[PDB]
Design a protein around this ligand. Sequence first.
Ligand SMILES: *[C@@H]1O[C@H](CO)[C@@H](O[C@@H]2O[C@H](CO)[C@@H](O)[C@H](O)[C@H]2NC(C)=O)[C@H](O)[C@H]1NC(C)=O
Ligand SMILES: *[C@@H]1O[C@H](CO)[C@@H](O)[C@H](O)[C@H]1NC(C)=O
Ligand SMILES: *[C@@H]1O[C@H](CO)[C@@H](O)[C@H](O)[C@H]1NC(C)=O
Lengths: 225, 916
Amino acid sequence: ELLLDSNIRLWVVLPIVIITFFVGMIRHYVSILLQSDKKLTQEQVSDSQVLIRSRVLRENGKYIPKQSFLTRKYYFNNPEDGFFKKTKRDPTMLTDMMKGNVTNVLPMILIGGWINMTFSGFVTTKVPFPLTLRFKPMLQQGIELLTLDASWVSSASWYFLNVFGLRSIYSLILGQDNAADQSPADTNKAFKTEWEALELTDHQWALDDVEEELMAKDLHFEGMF
Amino acid sequence: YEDQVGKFDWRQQYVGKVKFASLEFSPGSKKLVVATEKNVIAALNSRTGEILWRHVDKGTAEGAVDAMLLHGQDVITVSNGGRIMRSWETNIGGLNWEITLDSGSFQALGLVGLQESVRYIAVLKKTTLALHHLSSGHLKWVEHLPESDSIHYQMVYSYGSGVVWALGVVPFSHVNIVKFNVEDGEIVQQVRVSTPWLQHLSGACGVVDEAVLVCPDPSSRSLQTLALETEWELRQIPLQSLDLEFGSGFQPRVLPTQPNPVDASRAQFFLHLSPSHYALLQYHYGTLSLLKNFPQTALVSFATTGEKTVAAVMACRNEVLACFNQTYTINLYLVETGRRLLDTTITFSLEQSGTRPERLYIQVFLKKDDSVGYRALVQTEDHLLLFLQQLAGKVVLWSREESLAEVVCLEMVDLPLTDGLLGMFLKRLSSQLILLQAWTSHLNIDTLARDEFNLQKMMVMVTASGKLFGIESSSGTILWKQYLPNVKPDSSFKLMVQRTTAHFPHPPQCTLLVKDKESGMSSLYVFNPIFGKWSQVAPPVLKRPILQSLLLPVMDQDYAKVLLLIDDEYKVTAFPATRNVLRQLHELAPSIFFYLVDAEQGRLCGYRLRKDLTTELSWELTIPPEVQRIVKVKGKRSSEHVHSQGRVMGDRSVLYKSLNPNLLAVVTESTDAHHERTFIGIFLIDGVTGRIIHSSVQKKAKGPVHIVHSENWVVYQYWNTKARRNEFTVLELYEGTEQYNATAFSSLDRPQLPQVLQQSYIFPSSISAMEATITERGITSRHLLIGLPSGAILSLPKALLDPRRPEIPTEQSREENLIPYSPDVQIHAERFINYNQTVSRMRGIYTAPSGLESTCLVVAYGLDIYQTRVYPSKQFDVLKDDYDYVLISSVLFGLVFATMITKRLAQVKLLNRAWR
Ligand SMILES: *[C@@H]1O[C@H](CO)[C@@H](O[C@@H]2O[C@H](CO)[C@@H](O)[C@H](O)[C@H]2NC(C)=O)[C@H](O)[C@H]1NC(C)=O
Ligand SMILES: *[C@@H]1O[C@H](CO)[C@@H](O)[C@H](O)[C@H]1NC(C)=O
Ligand SMILES: *[C@@H]1O[C@H](CO)[C@@H](O)[C@H](O)[C@H]1NC(C)=O
């Protein structure tokens, strides 16, 4: 094998892991710190909640008798009622959203480049599986060897593997669905599509057969204590 | 380079055995001017023994120093058998005038004086005498001495009388003397006397007092004398009258002195009657008197402090010939009276055994109390310089091992190391507690230990003076020295590492194989390579002359590699040749082949190894010496590995190298030395079956040729007579696109002749030594350590010397990244592995794999010896020296706090947003 310098472990292997871990934490914390809710007026939240109610009605009107459901239908999408008809109305925001979307991967690539410069010329670890030779130019950046096994990796690709393998850990410790990783606007069209969808929907009162399906079995009663 | 001078590398400057020395200097000048057998003229610091200015010359005899003289502050030397005479300024360290002389064998050199000051030099050759000015070296006058076609001149004398005395002899017959005049040079006088018993004048005869010739005659045990100023007939005085006698089978000598050339010689002189015997005789007008007799004294010397002459006499404390302990005392005796000086005795001890002092040159001065204070430079038999100072403390001032000037062979030796599961766990946990205790407790050849990287080895060096050295490869110091008595200068050596230091229960063991050229008998010396002492295992007595030796990889029970020797009767002697060893090599006999290359007859023979320890003629080839003489038989190093068996050719295909481990690369020169018809042949003869893989012959080329043979390729530098330019020629051996025999390689199972790729490059300089960089696994790229005459060590990348470099770049070449063929090889000064540490008269370059994979240890040996490490792959596996610890730690510990702070900030913002 190869008698690698022990100091390469104490100053090039572990620091990379620590950097990746804390950079992920930093990135997640900066993401949550930067996020500020945009102010919403009454109309937008009102229409969003109205279409929410309409959709949940479409979803589960089955537990509601037919007349209540078709009265709901009349109220929402029907000329006479009026509802769903008389219900309608470098930029800073684009730059901000583009920067926010960019800051999820670009900092990682910049850190990788900085590491590649800072830690150029080493052999950090041997990958325990026989990688292909064609992957040599990128795994062994900063190494002048020619016949070296492809399983030996430079600092940059080791950092890349580290950053690839730590997202699950981030979700494990930081919390579920953390932001440290690598990866309605229009109501008129929404109104019309809700109109069409709830027009297409039908009714099936799920209570039409609850009694018969209840009479079959006795009521659970144990554990009353 | 990288401007980290002195961090790992070390150079030592060594001159050869001191042929001529000069100690006479101003007390404040603190200089020694010495010319050695290595054609080197150097200045040594008197206080510490260091080089002030050193001027090496041609290695051959065409620059050999023949006579040194000192006058005032500039030293005058004669080189090339009297062909050139030079004057060197000792202060500046350069020439003053260089003058070529006429033909004729030089016989005697001397100075002349007009009335009170020496101003011209009288140099005498076997047929003539010449005078040269001191100021500029202009020739004053040349005279052909009469009858010189028969006589042999041996001495020259002059003094303030403004005349020249010339003396010549004819063996066992009459001798002649000529008087010239310094002003003109004409033959003022000429006399002849009969000396039937005389043999030669310089070795036996001498001249003392006022030019009085004194020949010691052992035939009659007397001292024949001739008052050369006036006497015309030799006179005789027996030594019995002075109570003296000569030895048996010895030539007595006479040692006169002359404090300055202008004045006459001192009347008193030494007489070497018999070995370990000397006398002090004072000649006074036809008669002589014994001043002091020195028995059992090895060496005597004379010095002048300006007014009085001082004699130094050397003898050991108590004789036991030989000497009890190598403790030699030198005593000062006045020359005016044979009285020992007071409080001037010096006593020293020679470290080695079997070595006795050979040369003694003393320098005297006046002390504060007007006492003659003297220092002595003594060269021992084993080419060692000792500087002895009168004061008791540090009786030796600077001990210089000039012997290491001519090293024959050296090696690098690694330093010594620094059923039931319940039992295994118990011992493992016990070890754990032991290690914990050792860690918690943390709250020189004696202790020599191997480095972590194995980067610090120990070099076992062999010197043609028969001396063994152990030099630390890191600091260059000497750890152990041993001497081999009775080693001829031309003896052939062979050093083999039989057992390394990886066998702690067993002592490390190395074997050196010496072979006297004249006798032919070879001997084996086994020693511990770490401590230097001979192993108690008596080596076998090689009765018959031997021809070749092999270091079989098979090892004995004590992990000693089996060594085989082939004698003159073509028998094989094993070592240790035990029953187990005998059985192993008898059972594996038919797979062992020797090849003997008789260069004299241009013959190559290959012998088998029979079961019963006998050799048979397996194959035999003959290169006719009448048109070709074998000059090099460079085979590939046995201790190397090849990482990539094949090479990527692009195209997603592979081209297989022709890895033949039994491939010789015999290079022969053309016996025709004509500049237009000379040629150099290279044959890739196989080592087992004798098949000549390739038989290239480069026309219109001349040696010397420096060839390196590696894993697959060979590279041989040569001279091109047609165009007058050093040229390389790389031969790469390639197999087909698919390997023939993979599992194993057999030289008997290669019916496919490997293809050869050739390419000739131009080297814009000369060369002195070549050797490929060797790595443990051969992963690191290969570099040739070009040894320039200037002393630098060029690190030429082997990838540059590819023979596949196309003359016109193509897409295949660009895919393979092949540089277009360029016949010129650059000698960029940035490639030298040494900066200004030039190794004058470089002899060889040793490359050791070392540990790691990017560092190869380099020892350039020649006159100087230099050691360093080379990184052909820029030291890829080691942390850089310029690591920013204070930046990495700072960012880490300024980022952990940042993480804490930003977590607190996130918590605060979340709480505020929750509460609003
Ligand atoms: C000549 O050789 C010496 C000894 O190897 C080199 O050593 C020192 O190098 C540093 C480089 O900064 C100089 O400052 C010192 O003055 C040198 N010490 C000396 C010369 O005694 C030196 O660098 C070499 N010079 C060159 C031009 O290669
Ligand atoms: C001479 O005596 C010294 C002092 O005891 C000792 O070190 C040395 O080995 C002895 N022998 C020789 C050959 O120098
Ligand atoms: C090589 O040659 C041997 C016979 O010498 C044969 O047995 C073997 O199969 C061949 N090939 C390999 C890959 O060993």
